[PDB]
Each structure stands twice: as C-alpha cells, then as structure tokens.
Amino acid sequence: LSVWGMYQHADIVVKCVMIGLILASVVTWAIFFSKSVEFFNQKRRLKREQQLLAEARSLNQANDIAADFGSKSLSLHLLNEAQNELELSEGSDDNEGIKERTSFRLERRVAAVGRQMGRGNGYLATIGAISPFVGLFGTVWGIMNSFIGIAQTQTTNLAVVAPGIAEALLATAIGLVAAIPAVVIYNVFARQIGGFKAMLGDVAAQVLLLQSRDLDLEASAAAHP
Amino acid sequence: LSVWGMYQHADIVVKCVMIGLILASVVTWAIFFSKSVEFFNQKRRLKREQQLLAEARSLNQANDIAADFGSKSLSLHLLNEAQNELELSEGSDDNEGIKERTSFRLERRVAAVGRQMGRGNGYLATIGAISPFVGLFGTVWGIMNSFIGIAQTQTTNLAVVAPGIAEALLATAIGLVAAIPAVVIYNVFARQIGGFKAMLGDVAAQVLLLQSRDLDLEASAAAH
Amino acid sequence: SVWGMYQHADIVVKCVMIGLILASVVTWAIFFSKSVEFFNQKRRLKREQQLLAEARSLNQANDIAADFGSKSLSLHLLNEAQNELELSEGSDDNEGIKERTSFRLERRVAAVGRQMGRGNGYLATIGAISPFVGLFGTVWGIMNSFIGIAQTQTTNLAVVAPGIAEALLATAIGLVAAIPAVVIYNVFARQIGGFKAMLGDVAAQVLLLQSRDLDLEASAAAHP
Amino acid sequence: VWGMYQHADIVVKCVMIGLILASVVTWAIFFSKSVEFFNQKRRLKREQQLLAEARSLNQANDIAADFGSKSLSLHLLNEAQNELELSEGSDDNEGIKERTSFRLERRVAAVGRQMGRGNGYLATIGAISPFVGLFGTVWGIMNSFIGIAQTQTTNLAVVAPGIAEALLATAIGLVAAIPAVVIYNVFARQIGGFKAMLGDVAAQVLLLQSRDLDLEASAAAHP
Amino acid sequence: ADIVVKCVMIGLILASVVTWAIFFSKSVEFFNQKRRLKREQQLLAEARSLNQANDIAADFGSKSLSLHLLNEAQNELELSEGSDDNEGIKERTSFRLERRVAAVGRQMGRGNGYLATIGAISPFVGLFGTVWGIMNSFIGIAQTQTTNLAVVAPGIAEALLATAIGLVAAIPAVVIYNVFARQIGGFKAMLGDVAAQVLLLQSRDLDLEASAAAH
C-alpha cells in the first residue's frame, strides 16, 4: 500500500520503532526552538553588556555602568560577586589574597552557567547517535520475521514477501529522518555555546582585571602618600 | 513466530549468543537502576547541604551548620579535612603555606570521589564494547549456516537459506538491544558523574574560600 | 544512460543527489576561501616572528614592529602589553603588571582561535551527515523497488535493477561528499593548532621581554 | 593481473591505485621516521644518563660541552644560560626561574609539534581508507546491477565481475587501512614517551638552575 | 584451502596467544605491586614527620616505590643544604615527585598497546581473510560458465570462519584491555597518594621549622 497503510500494516515491534523515532524527532524540534530564542536573546544581551563594560577602566565605573543591567543580568552578578568579596574581606592587609579569592569565585560561576547552558544537550547528542541504530533494529526485526515467514509453509516467489521488506526498510528511513536534524542542531549548539562561554569569560576577565588594578593602585597610592 | 519458540527453534551457538547477550542486557539495566537511585540520592542530599552551608560567613559557622549532617556526609568530610590541616599546621607562621596544603588535600578528595562513582562504569563500557562483536559473531554464524544449507541441499532455493539468515538477523537484533543501552547509559553516567564531581568541587571551593579569608583576617588583625 | 539512470530514481532520491552535490560544492568553496586567507595570515605571522626574535628589549621590540602595517597580530599583542603598562602607571607592585599582561595576552590568543574556527563547523557537520543522507537515499530507493515487486506479481524480470542501481549511486555520492569534508576539516584542525602555537610563541616573547625589563628596571632603581 | 585488474572500469581502477598509493605513503613514512626516531632517542638517553651526575649547572655545561651543535640538551642548557645572561643584575631571582621554565617547556612543546609532522597523514589514511574502500564496493555492486539491467539475463555469471571488483575494493580498503592505524597508534605511544623524556632532561636543567640561584643568593647573606 | 586465509587465521591465533601471555604475566605484576603499595601506604599512615617516614620505609626493600619517593624528597633536602628559601625546596621536590609518578605510570601501560590494537584490528584482519576468500570464489565462478552457487558455498563458509576467528581473537583482548586499564587507574591513584603524603609531610615540616627559627 502507500506510506500510511504501510505504517498501519506493519508489525507491532516495527510500529513501535517508527513511533519512537517520530517522537525523538518531535523532541529534537522542540528543543531546537526554545533553546534558539533563549540563546539569541542572552547572547546579544551579553554582547551589549561587554561593549558597555569595556569602558569601565575603574570597577567603580563598572558597577556604575552596570548599575541597571537587570536583576537577571550576568555581568551584574559577576560585578556583585567581586564587590561582595571586597566587602567580606574588609580589613585584610593581604591583597594577594583578595585577588585569589576573587578569581576562584568568578571562574566558578562561569563554568556553572556554562553547564546550565548545556543542559539538554545530552538528548540531542544521544538521539543523533542512536536513532539510525534503533531504526536498524526495526528493519532487522522486520526482515527477520519475514524470513521466519518464508520458511513456514514454506514459500518462494519473492513478490509474496516484498511488503514485509518494504515496511521494514521504512523503519531505517524514519530513523535517519529523525537522526539527521539532531546531529546538525547539536553541532550548532556546541559551537554557539562555545562562543557564549567565551563571551561570558571575557566579561569576567574584565571584572578581575579591574579589581586587580584597583587593589594595586590603592595599595601603591597609600604607600607613598 | 514468537520469542521463546525462536530460542528453542534455533542452533546451539545462537542459543549461547542469545543467552549471553540477554544476560549482558540484564546486568546493564540492573547497574542502571541501583546506581540511578543512588546517584539521585547523593545529588539531592548534597544539594541540601550546600544550601545550608551557603549562609556561612565563617568557617566556624560552617562547622556548626554542618555539625549534624550525617556520619557519611561528604561536606562534613571536607570541613573535617580542612580542620585536620589547620590542626596539623598549628603554630605555622606561613599561612600561604596552610592554604596550599589545604587546597591540595581538598581537590584530591573530590577526584577520588569521582573514581568511586565510576567504580561501576567499567562493566557498562565493556558490555557496550563487546556486544556488537558477539552479535556480529552470531550473525556470521547464521549466514555460514545458510551456505552450509545450500551446500547440503544443492538447491539455491530461498527456503533452505531462510533458517540461517533468520538466525543471523536474530543475532543482530539481540546484539543491538544489548549494545545500544550500554553505550547511552555509559555516556549518561559520564555526564551525571561530571555534574556531581563539579558540584562537590563547588562545596570544596566554599571551604577553601572560608579558610583563606579567615586566615587573612586573623593575620592582618593582629599587628596592628 | 546517466540521464536514464537519474530518470529511474524517484523525487526524494533526487533531493538526496542534488543535496549532496550542493554540499560538495560548498565544502570546496570553504576550502579555497579559508585556504587562501589562512596561508596569507600564516606567512605574515612567520615573517613577523622571524623579525621579532632579535629584539633584546621591549623598546627594541616596539621599534622593530613599527609596521608590520596595522591589522597584524603582533602589533595587537605588543599594544595590549603597552596598554597594561600605561593603565598601571604609578603602581609599585610589578608582580601585578606581569600577571595582568599574561591574562590578557593568553586570552587574546584564544579569541584568535575562535575566529579561525568560525565556519569549520560546516565542514564537520557535512562530513558527519553526508553518509547518513546517502544511506537514506539508498534505503528509500530500495524500499520503492520492493513495493514495485509487490504490486506486480509472479517474479521481477529486469524492472528495478536501475532503481536499485540509483539507490546505490545515492550512497556512492554520499561518501563522495562526505570524505573531502572530513579530510579538509582535519587539515584545518592541524594547521589551526600550529597557528595557535606560533601566535602563542610570539605572545610568549612579548611576555618574556616585559618581565625581564620590569625586573631590571626595578633592580636598577633599588640601588643607585 | 595487469590485464585482469585493468578490465572493465575507470573509477574502480582509480580507487585501487589511490588506496595502494596510500599504503605506499604509510610505509615510506614508517621507514624514514623510524630511523630518525631511533637515532634521536638513542642520543637523548645517552645525554640524560651523562647529565645525571652533574652536581651543579656548570658541571652540566661541561658534560654537555661536546654533545654537538644539533643536540637538544645543549639547546636547553644554552637557553638556561642565555636567560641568566639577559637577566644579569636583577635582584629578583623568583623571576629568573619563572622566565627559564616558560622558555624550556615551550621548546619541548615545539619539538613535540615537530615530532607529529606527518602523523596527520597516517591518521587520515587509516581514517578514510575503509570508507574509500566501501565506496569502491558500492560502486562495484552498482555496476553489477547495471549489468543485469543491460542484458536482462538475470543470474549468475553476469553479476560476477561486479561482485569481484567490489570485494577487491573492500580488500584493498582494509590493506591500506589497518597498517596506517596501527602505525599511527605506535607513533602516539612513542611521541608521548619521547616528549616525556625530553621533559625529564628539561626538568633536570630547571632544577639545577633554581637550586644554584638559591644557594648563591643565600650564600652571600649570612656568611 | 587457498593460502592467505590460513595465514590470516594462524596470525589471529598467534595474536590470541599473545593476548593470553600478556594476561598472565601482567596479572602477576599488577597484583604483586598493588599489594606491596597497599601495605606501604598503610604503614606510612603512621608518619608524623618526614624523618619518621624515611624511617618506616628504610627496609621496605630497595625496589620499593615509596622508598624511591621518600629518598627523592630527602635527596632534595640534602642537595639544598644551606638554602634559606623553603619555598624553593618545596617546589623542586614537587617537580621531582611529579616526574616520578608519571614515569612509573608510563611504565605500567607499556604493554596495553598490544592488547588494544589486537582487539581493535582483529575483526578487520579476519574480514580481510573472508573478503579475499569470497573474492577468490566469485573469481572462480567468472571462468568457464556457471550457475547454482551450491558449488562454491563451502569456500564461502570457509571464508566466513576467518571473520569468526577474528572476532573470537578480538573479544578476550578487549575485555583484558579494559580490566588492565582499570587496574592501572587504581595503581596510578595509589602511587599518587603516597607521593601526596610525602609532599605534605615535607611542606609541613619545612613550615614549622622555618616558623620556629623566625622567633
């Protein structure tokens, strides 16, 4: 018959492989769309925050430029973390300490944010790796039941078994149709998440540089009054 | 046909391939379930303890918040390790020293915990590695039995070849059912173990910060 | 007949073949464009490193690198070091200046890498799914053949040999599109690796010059 | 045979010549880089065994005096000494040490990248050889189905040349593929070990320089 | 029959022999050294100094690993006699120890390459055997005039055995390789732990001594 009947006319196991593979494709596209809107907003937002903070030259000016970036802004969180380490460390004479303690804090959040961006990447990678193989299982089960069929009665004349071989190869086809988009989407998510982690790393490096420069200039400036 | 029949209906070799691969699938899923509930527990409780220790403005406050956690808790082991390095170093004028030795200890413990979490990953990795070879051996056995069929019958028909090819495809089907879940489960366990080792590392960072901050505030506070 | 072979396939397998031919076209475009760009930039960098290897100081380096034109990378690194010396004027802690310079220069190199690998993702993905798209071509094709043997009865005389021949041509083109993508990507990884290495060596030369000069200046003004 | 393998096709003959060429490249690489590797490793182990007895850096420069101009250890020792001369007059030793290591380790890294030149070829040949072979076989059985379409004589003597050239394609694919990957893996092991040994000699130089700087700076303080 | 197929199969069987030889000899090595190291670590757990550690390990045996690490730290303390900088000694000692462990690691994994490659390329060399065989068979049916494959079927089965042997040679190589990777992992971990103890004791003693002579 045609494709729809060929689905409805196939075995139960092969039916399950096909329905599963279409489901994996559905998940592939849902993941794609939501993470798309997210990453574009956040990436160009962060691009702005980096362009603005590039003028800071101070870290008082950084907190001032970032004074309103939003309560979910990432640069506002990093700047606030450095500031909080300056406030908790009030009274320390060892700057070499503050800087260390500051860096350890900042570089710890970036990675965490990175790890939250890659949450769900397991599904895309796994679907793109597995889907052709689960499909391959669908067809191999199909033609296996077919060859069990041709030695029962036992038949000949290949045109009698051909529907089974068709309805089996459909499973590999569906496996590949679900598999390919998963692979592409995963690759752009890897590269783009890479660029984002890099950009966030650039803002954090600005914060650390400004803080170090302030501690050095204050300590040296009040050493020779 | 059906499954049980397909077994009792087949050769001795494909009988051993089916029993072997079926066993391998059984161990794969058992590992999955026990280590899954365990990992869920460890992450849940650890995240709780981190939330409690987040209020600590001082290392003493951390030891007090962590006083009643658990005899086997991980955060109590880290705080206890810092305490032990402060005690062994008592009287040292080099704080920059203490800090070093402390970090060195803490960030080793985390790594070690990782290797204990991956204590079971060897089986999944190996099952996923050898399942396609055992399946492929089964199928080659099948197609070989087919050509023996065409050697006896001197026929070339489809129905003398059919049993051997059907057996081969059976070996392949079960081969995939044993091979794939081992690999996905192994990778999902790598991903989850990574996240766990990372979280524990974050608590270690809290301990290290509290220690460094306190040592700096004390050394600077008595001068005057 | 090639035209007849093509006319024997299907509309889906047609998309597979034109798609694979397009993908091969884009891979070769990428190869030529980024190849000429990369050779130009590499030869430029080798020239500049050969020149800067003779600078006994940082003033001598800024002088040898006068131009070098503009968009050059070494002038960008030297300018970053200079910018960090100027922002720190009046700081007595030289340990600081040094630290900060490395943090910038190192990171700058990384950014160059990320700008070199922009667009290589295309090659990686094309080489990744090309055999899978070809394979889809062949399985869809052979599926159409077996449906053909299903609606017409008795046996199949010659009818779909060509359909099957065209599916197999789909896999053939799939591999022919896949292989050059992967080879090109690997040469780009190797060459980018060497490039980051050379740029890293120039950055390291700048760092060495800065450290040596600040140390000798501080020591010469630490006794008259 | 020369007439047998040349019989009936262009593309399949071209994959055949390509894969055999790839095998030639793997084995030529094998012999040339083999003699090079054994020579350089022998020389390095000799030099490390000799330098193990130097109680200072000057004793090291004396053990390495005659090592030769192309020798690696003389290059490392010369790098350390040159960093001592460029830093002449600095009161900060904590610095000198740093600058030396950064130089030395990078030299090693550079030699590492100089060892892996050409290993890319082995890696790629072993990587794509089964796939180029697979294309050979798919082209072959495709030519078989073309053969049964022309004559319409069905089986079995017509499919035979196509199946023959297909299995020849797979056979040549494996014969080019396997030695390439095995040789590449031994080159990973050996390049790892050699990079490590070079690291050990470099580490000896760094240690001697640091220890002598400390004993000099501490030696004119109290006495 | 033929020639190549039998040489390929005997090659695979020799590879299986090497698999089992590595299995037994490396088994003895890893068990012995792992036991010795476990004992030495439990004994050095009593160390409150670096001198007490050099003393507990004095007789551990000359080929002992922990005596080599402890002897390296002590030798760095002796070569540095007269240095006022304790932050120096520490560094050099770490650097020294950090080579030691790595070298020992590299020496334990000297043989795993063979198992890895045998298990990787065994099915493919076997596959070459059968593909050469079936190629010889279809070359056979391409002479004279033929049909009815029942004539060449035994040759083809004989070919498929080459792959069977390839896979059967591959499996023990792969399992053995994974087990030896795990054991080397645990071993590198233990050796690293002993080195870490030596480093701590040295650092702590240099700090307490240096702080005692500041007052």
Partner: peptide
C-alpha cells in the same frame, strides 16, 4: 561513521543473498 562499515556490509549481504537465487 564507524558501524557504517558493518551496516553497509550487512546491507550488501542482504542485497547479494537475493542476487544469489535463482534464476
């Protein structure tokens, strides 16, 4: 990209085994 060898060889035996019969 790896099993594809095994996949295409198994496929080629599913293509060649029907090529075997009859005619």
């Amino acid at each position: 990209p790896f099993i594809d060898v095994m996949l295409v060889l198994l496929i080629i035996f599913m293509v060649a085994a029907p090529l075997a019969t009859v005619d």
